Design an enzyme around this catalytic site. Sequence first.
Site, mmCIF file in Angstrom:
data_model
loop_
_atom_site.group_PDB
_atom_site.id
_atom_site.type_symbol
_atom_site.label_atom_id
_atom_site.label_comp_id
_atom_site.label_asym_id
_atom_site.label_seq_id
_atom_site.Cartn_x
_atom_site.Cartn_y
_atom_site.Cartn_z
ATOM 1 N N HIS A 23 -22.412 10.504 55.413
ATOM 2 C CA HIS A 23 -21.429 9.728 55.142
ATOM 3 C C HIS A 23 -22.177 8.607 55.037
ATOM 4 O O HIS A 23 -22.930 7.955 56.590
ATOM 5 C CB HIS A 23 -20.780 10.074 55.465
ATOM 6 C CG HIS A 23 -19.528 11.683 55.072
ATOM 7 N ND1 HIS A 23 -18.531 11.923 55.995
ATOM 8 C CD2 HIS A 23 -19.709 12.267 53.861
ATOM 9 C CE1 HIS A 23 -18.591 13.154 55.118
ATOM 10 N NE2 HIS A 23 -18.743 12.870 54.244
ATOM 11 N N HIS A 47 -17.270 19.623 59.981
ATOM 12 C CA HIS A 47 -17.357 18.350 59.397
ATOM 13 C C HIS A 47 -17.403 18.057 57.720
ATOM 14 O O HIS A 47 -17.190 17.746 56.750
ATOM 15 C CB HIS A 47 -17.201 16.788 59.495
ATOM 16 C CG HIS A 47 -17.043 15.477 59.506
ATOM 17 N ND1 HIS A 47 -16.008 14.694 59.342
ATOM 18 C CD2 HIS A 47 -17.787 14.863 59.039
ATOM 19 C CE1 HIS A 47 -15.958 13.960 58.906
ATOM 20 N NE2 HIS A 47 -17.363 13.525 58.484
ATOM 21 N N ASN A 68 -10.976 13.044 57.446
ATOM 22 C CA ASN A 68 -12.127 13.142 56.135
ATOM 23 C C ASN A 68 -12.633 13.998 56.106
ATOM 24 O O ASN A 68 -13.719 14.806 56.422
ATOM 25 C CB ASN A 68 -13.411 11.710 56.165
ATOM 26 C CG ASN A 68 -13.658 12.009 54.641
ATOM 27 O OD1 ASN A 68 -13.146 12.229 54.098
ATOM 28 N ND2 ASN A 68 -15.123 10.972 54.162
HETATM 29 ZN ZN LIG Z 1 -18.555 12.440 57.866
HETATM 30 ZN ZN LIG Z 2 -17.504 9.753 60.243
#
Ligand SMILES: [Zn+2]
Ligand SMILES: [Zn+2]
Length: 235
Positions: free
Chosen positions: A85, A148, A179
């Site tokens: 990310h 995650h 997220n």
């Molecule tokens: Zn992330």
């Molecule tokens: Zn993050």
Amino acid sequence: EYPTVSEIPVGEVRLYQIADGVWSHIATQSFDGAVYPSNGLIVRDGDELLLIDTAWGAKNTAALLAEIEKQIGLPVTRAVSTHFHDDRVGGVDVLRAAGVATYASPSTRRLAEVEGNEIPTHSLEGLSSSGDAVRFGPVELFYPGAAHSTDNLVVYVPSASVLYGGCAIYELSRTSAGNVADADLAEWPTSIERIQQRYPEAQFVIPGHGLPGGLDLLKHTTNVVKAHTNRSVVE
Ligand SMILES: [Zn+2]
Ligand SMILES: [Zn+2]
Ligand code: NA
Ligand SMILES: [Zn+2]
């Protein structure tokens, strides 16, 4: 004294010394109409520095490099991104132009490319399967399994007993799932247990976003993730 989100203007980066030779870096970014803080790590590596994660974007990462030189004065020579990310690879091009050797696992590099995010140059070997760990300069990199994200790595500094969980670990103030678009909610608790079983000696635990604490950040994260899986928010 750890800086909070309202204490860091977007575009600025603060450093916080956690232990001898270990700092976190803290930046902020607009995300989903809110302002979020984001942590990375800096680990002294002889007369150089190893960076863990960018500061979430090119502008913040340039400010990170400037703040490192202002406060520490040693060159950043390598950087590891802990998942694909933008809060982890956004700014890799800035690091590369500044002569930093950027690294991520093959899985992170591939997912970054698919997503359209910046791609670290070097590929880390030996992190393909859940439970894999490799030494990388003064840290150990650990792949605990999907949480995650499917590629998320955690980082342990054995000389300082500092466990950097990245976005697989939530700060205590986070009561609800963040997220989770790319998360494996089902494997996340199992992956956290792998972290707990490997690093029971950790004294400081740094989440990807927010305040550090101790190892009870791991159980807190499992509680929040499980509540989310059950369509529940408790805290
Ligand atoms: Zn992330
Ligand atoms: Zn993050
Ligand atoms: Na070295
Ligand atoms: Zn909690």
